[PDB]
Amino acid sequence: VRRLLGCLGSETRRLSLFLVLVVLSSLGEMAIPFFTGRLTDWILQDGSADTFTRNLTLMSILTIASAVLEFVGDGIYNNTMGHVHSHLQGEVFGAVLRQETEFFQQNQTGNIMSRVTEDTSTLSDSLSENLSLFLWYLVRGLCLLGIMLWGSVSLTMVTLITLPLLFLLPKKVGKWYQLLEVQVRESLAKSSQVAIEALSAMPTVRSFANEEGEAQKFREKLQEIKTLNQKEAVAYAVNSWTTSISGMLLKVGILYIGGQLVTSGAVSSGNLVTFVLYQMQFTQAVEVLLSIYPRVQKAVGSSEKIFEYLDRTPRCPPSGLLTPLHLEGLVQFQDVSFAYPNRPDVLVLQGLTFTLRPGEVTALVGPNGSGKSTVAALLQNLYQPTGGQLLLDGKPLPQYEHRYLHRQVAAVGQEPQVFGRSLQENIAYGLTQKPTMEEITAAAVKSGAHSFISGLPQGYDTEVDEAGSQLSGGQRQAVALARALIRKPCVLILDDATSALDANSQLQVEQLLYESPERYSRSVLLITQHLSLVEQADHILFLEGGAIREGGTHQQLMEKKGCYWAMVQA
Amino acid sequence: QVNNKVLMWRLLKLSRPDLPLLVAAFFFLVLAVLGETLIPHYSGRVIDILGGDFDPHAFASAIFFMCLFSFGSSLSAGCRGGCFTYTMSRINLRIREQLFSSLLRQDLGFFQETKTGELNSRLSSDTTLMSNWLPLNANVLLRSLVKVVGLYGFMLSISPRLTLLSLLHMPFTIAAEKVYNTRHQEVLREIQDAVARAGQVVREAVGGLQTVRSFGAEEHEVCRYKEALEQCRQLYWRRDLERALYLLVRRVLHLGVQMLMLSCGLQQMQDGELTQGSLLSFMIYQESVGSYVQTLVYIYGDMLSNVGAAEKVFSYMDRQPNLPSPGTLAPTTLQGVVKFQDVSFAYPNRPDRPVLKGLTFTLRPGEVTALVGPNGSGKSTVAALLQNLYQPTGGQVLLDEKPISQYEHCYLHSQVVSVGQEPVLFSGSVRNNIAYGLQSCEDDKVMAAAQAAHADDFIQEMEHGIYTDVGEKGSQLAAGQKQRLAIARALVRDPRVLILDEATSALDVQCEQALQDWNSRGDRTVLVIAHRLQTVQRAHQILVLQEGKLQ
Numbered sequence A: 001v002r003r004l005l006g007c008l009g010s011e012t013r014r015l016s017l018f019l020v021l022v023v024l025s026s027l028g029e030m031a032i033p034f035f036t037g038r039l040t041d042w043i044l045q046d047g048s049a050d051t052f053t054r055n056l057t058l059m060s061i062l063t064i065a066s067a068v069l070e071f072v073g074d075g076i077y078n079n080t081m082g083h084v085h086s087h088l089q090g091e092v093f094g095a096v097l098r099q100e101t102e103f104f105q106q107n108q109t110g111n112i113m114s115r116v117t118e119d120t121s122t123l124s125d126s127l128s129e130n131l132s133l134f135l136w137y138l139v140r141g142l143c144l145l146g147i148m149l150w151g152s153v154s155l156t157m158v159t160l161i162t163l164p165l166l167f168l169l170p171k172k173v174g175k176w177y178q179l180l181e182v183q184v185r186e187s188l189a190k191s192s193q194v195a196i197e198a199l200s201a202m203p204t205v206r207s208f209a210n211e212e213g214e215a216q217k218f219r220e221k222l223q224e225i226k227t228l229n230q231k232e233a234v235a236y237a238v239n240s241w242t243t244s245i246s247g248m249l250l251k252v253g254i255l256y257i258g259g260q261l262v263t264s265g266a267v268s269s270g271n272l273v274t275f276v277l278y279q280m281q282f283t284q285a286v287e288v289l290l291s292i293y294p295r296v297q298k299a300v301g302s303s304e305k306i307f308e309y310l311d312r313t314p315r316c317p318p319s320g321l322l323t324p325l326h327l328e329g330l331v332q333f334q335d336v337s338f339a340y341p342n343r344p345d346v347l348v349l350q351g352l353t354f355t356l357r358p359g360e361v362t363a364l365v366g367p368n369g370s371g372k373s374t375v376a377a378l379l380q381n382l383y384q385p386t387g388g389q390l391l392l393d394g395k396p397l398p399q400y401e402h403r404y405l406h407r408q409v410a411a412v413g414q415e416p417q418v419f420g421r422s423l424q425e426n427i428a429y430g431l432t433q434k435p436t437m438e439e440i441t442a443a444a445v446k447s448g449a450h451s452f453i454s455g456l457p458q459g460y461d462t463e464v465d466e467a468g469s470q471l472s473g474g475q476r477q478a479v480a481l482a483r484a485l486i487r488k489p490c491v492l493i494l495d496d497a498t499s500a501l502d503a504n505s506q507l508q509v510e511q512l513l514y515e516s517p518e519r520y521s522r523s524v525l526l527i528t529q530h531l532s533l534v535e536q537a538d539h540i541l542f543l544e545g546g547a548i549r550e551g552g553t554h555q556q557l558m559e560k561k562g563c564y565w566a567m568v569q570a
Numbered sequence B: 001q002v003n004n005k006v007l008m009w010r011l012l013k014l015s016r017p018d019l020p021l022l023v024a025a026f027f028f029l030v031l032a033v034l035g036e037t038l039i040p041h042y043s044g045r046v047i048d049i050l051g052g053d054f055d056p057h058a059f060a061s062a063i064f065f066m067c068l069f070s071f072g073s074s075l076s077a078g079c080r081g082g083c084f085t086y087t088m089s090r091i092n093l094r095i096r097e098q099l100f101s102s103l104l105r106q107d108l109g110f111f112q113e114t115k116t117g118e119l120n121s122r123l124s125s126d127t128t129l130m131s132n133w134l135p136l137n138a139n140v141l142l143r144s145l146v147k148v149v150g151l152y153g154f155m156l157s158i159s160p161r162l163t164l165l166s167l168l169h170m171p172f173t174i175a176a177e178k179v180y181n182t183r184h185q186e187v188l189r190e191i192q193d194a195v196a197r198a199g200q201v202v203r204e205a206v207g208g209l210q211t212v213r214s215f216g217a218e219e220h221e222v223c224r225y226k227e228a229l230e231q232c233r234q235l236y237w238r239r240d241l242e243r244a245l246y247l248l249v250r251r252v253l254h255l256g257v258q259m260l261m262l263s264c265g266l267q268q269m270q271d272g273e274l275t276q277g278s279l280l281s282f283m284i285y286q287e288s289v290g291s292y293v294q295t296l297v298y299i300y301g302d303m304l305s306n307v308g309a310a311e312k313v314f315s316y317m318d319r320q321p322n323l324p325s326p327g328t329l330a331p332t333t334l335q336g337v338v339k340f341q342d343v344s345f346a347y348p349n350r351p352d353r354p355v356l357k358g359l360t361f362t363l364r365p366g367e368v369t370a371l372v373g374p375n376g377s378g379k380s381t382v383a384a385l386l387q388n389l390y391q392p393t394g395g396q397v398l399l400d401e402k403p404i405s406q407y408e409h410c411y412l413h414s415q416v417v418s419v420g421q422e423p424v425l426f427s428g429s430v431r432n433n434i435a436y437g438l439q440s441c442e443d444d445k446v447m448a449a450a451q452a453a454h455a456d457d458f459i460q461e462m463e464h465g466i467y468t469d470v471g472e473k474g475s476q477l478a479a480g481q482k483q484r485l486a487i488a489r490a491l492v493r494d495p496r497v498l499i500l501d502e503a504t505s506a507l508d509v510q511c512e513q514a515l516q517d518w519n520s521r522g523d524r525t526v527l528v529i530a531h532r533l534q535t536v537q538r539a540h541q542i543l544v545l546q547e548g549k550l551q
């Protein structure tokens, strides 16, 4: 379509040079038969030898130049094709990565977007060379037609007239063979189906000892397909015979009409020899074009799939432009109600309203489910609220710049992922500026991960494989905490970061939450199952069914004697 | 690597009974090649005739011979193609039938272990590849060899000096091809490694997207992907440059040999030992000869590469069944005394986990023996062991003071029959499924069996009576109708030992019991399986089986 020309237009300076080289090489590669005919005619006229050596040198020079020009043009085309293929791959990946989280939560189809991009590889090659093979040949054919027409218009007119009669008749004949093949395939499928049906009930076919019956019923099916096979063979034989004789008789016809022309005196024998040598190459070029065309047709037909991912509209608000240099970190919820866009019939959150202020720790507690992690997912702008408002320092989340907002708010999830790279890169993941070693050591000390980092033989540069199989759960929790603590965030979410951790890590977290000197510039939302950390929190929020029922400090909730009291007693 | 050699020997032995077709196809191929290769020689003769003084008779004769040879070559080519396609189809049919017949004799454990889809894939796909393997490769090899021999014979006929000049070309081409392939293999390995490394980053980024979006590191992954794509593109360009250089050197060599041959031929024609038509025919032959010798030198690898799609089916045919040798006891004295002595069974698919713990009981001809127990106790296993579908791991079974495995396979199942727990129906008609496993029968016996099983009430509602067609896997009748049909199918044979694994049945088996005491006739041993003790209560002998132990 027009999109291929649009993405190929950035190089229409090199493509013109490639086309010029191609036409020059095609012109120069055909001097061999012409000079053969000329030199043979000169021998028959017993001429001189200076013209002989001159013509030999000229033909050699022309052929050498043709080969060199073909090589140079092929190199230029390959270089440009590789460049545009790399650009297209980068563009399609960048377009895929911009879609909203609702597109990516279908992890059961995750490999699809791990495959479609790779499809853009195997498609592009299927279009990279075939389009060359077409383009390298058609002009070549057009070159040959430019010489035989100069030789004698009658013979080239004859071969042009009878070319379709030899290159379309087998196509018309092959329909019979193809339909017979389809019938044979369907009969074989039916026989295989009845064989599978017989085989799937082995206990009940052995209980009556009827294996001979199944053998007979399977032979009976093949006895019918034998006749279809015979008809298939006859049709194939007829197709082969016609596709042979139609192409073979053209040479005899050309020789007859050329002999008539030569006896008439219009042309000489050398022209006939050159025409005979040119006709085979012309036929080969035409056959190559006919073979090439369906493949490029299939490629351009299948190219429409990639553009679907390329221009898919994201269902998410655009990034804002706000980037203040001073954030207090106050977070307000105003009657927030959220339903998952995958199944928007269920309201997971309803009537949520609370305020987080710097220097104060808010502990969110509740049973399994009940949208505990959904509030954390909403807080870091991973989803948009169906109803209500989320306010950060008096401004909504989408109004902020994407990178700045995600730098100012940090979260530790239930199951932290660790990518495969150096260990000190995982600590500073996503940072715009590479931090110093002192900052990474300070972050490791704050999270307590520095105890076992120095025990590694490679230190902070220990490579990690995929999925973090080289580390235990507690080490992964420590590295995730240190990664979330490196940027000094304004709003810290710790959701299930105290589940499978060491006691030393628990002590480090407890010290960071309450007795750390830098807590005053931080607002913490803590989700945990340990009552010791919960009791020291300033505000406690109980979540059940996506609604807030019990709220206040620990003493007030103890005096309430409600759900939190039962949880404490349990 | 002798596995491929023995596989190809097996394929040749399988295709052995198609000798005349292959011989005729080879003869037609030789005729077609010989007829085709004469065309440029007669073209050269015509060209030589046209020069100099004219002679219409020679011209007409040459054109007539050209037409005749073209007609003969086309006819032979068509016949060869037809013969090869027919032998393809014959090989396919023979191998399909052989595989099915071999698979039909396996033990039950093999079918329990394997899957129906895998068997369908092996039967319906690999046989076509086996059929296509031999005649296609044979045609290619024979065509290449005959073409090479004929073309070089014609070179020798025209002029030997130019033939030697042409033959001087090959070794440089062979060496260049080998060197290019050796470098290309390493380049391809590097390409594969680089593309795997490039795909790793996109897989990792698309996996954990929530953590990526949490930290806003979306453009970083794009930059890393671009960095990987740069190395991939560099390796691609290096590979393309190597290929272009190889093509250039091949073209230069071909040009050199062509120019040398043309110069030598012109020098020879100047001396008077050649003619214009002979030179033209020699050029045509020289153009034609190269691809055939290339195919000839690559055909061994091409043929050996495709054999690796037929070893699975040969292994399936070569699998040894785990069954005892059949007996040869077919007596007419089969009053129906059945004994189980210390029978303990373990499933071969899941060994060392026995379900039977030393059963021992006796059956009687005229009386009724019922077996009761809870779900999962394993009464169906007792029925299967009584039907000689499995062998006991301990103790023995006796049928009229003879082991059951020493009876004839066809005779035993005509006397000891069983209505199964879940009846299975086939795609045949009602009459075909009622008389399943029977070579011949009469309509009266089928009608009597339908009346005895209380299945004749609904047998007249459908068209054509008992000859009514049934859907695939019996997907046309109700569950009660299927149960009645199965009961009639069992009762057709008029057995002596009758097992009725009712268990989960909804045919109001109270009617079956009220029919005639669970089909007991006083000379036929009956073993009826029931879920609850209260459902039968009239059996002369009652056995309760708990956890593989009798009570």
Ligand SMILES: Nc1ncnc2c1ncn2[C@@H]1O[C@H](COP(=O)(O)OP(=O)(O)OP(=O)(O)O)[C@@H](O)[C@H]1O
Pocket (backbone or CB within 6 Å): A105, A340, A342, A343, A348, A367, A368, A369, A370, A371, A372, A373, A374, A375
């Ligand atoms: N993508 C989704 N689409 C629809 N519903 C979802 C989706 N992800 C989670 N849920 C459901 O929404 C609720 C969110 O619960 P949430 O994950 O916050 O609970 P939790 O207490 O943190 O722990 P857990 O994950 O063990 O339930 C659950 O009922 C969950 O099954």
Ligand SMILES: Nc1ncnc2c1ncn2[C@@H]1O[C@H](COP(=O)(O)OP(=O)(O)OP(=O)(O)O)[C@@H](O)[C@H]1O
Pocket (backbone or CB within 6 Å): B112, B347, B349, B350, B355, B373, B374, B375, B376, B377, B378, B379, B380, B381, B382, B421, B503, B504
């Ligand atoms: N093909 C098999 N391979 C391995 N183990 C099997 C197989 N079929 C059944 N079993 C197991 O062997 C025992 C036989 O159970 P079986 O089905 O015969 O019980 P049953 O008492 O006849 O009752 P019902 O069939 O109505 O459930 C069970 O423990 C079952 O799980």
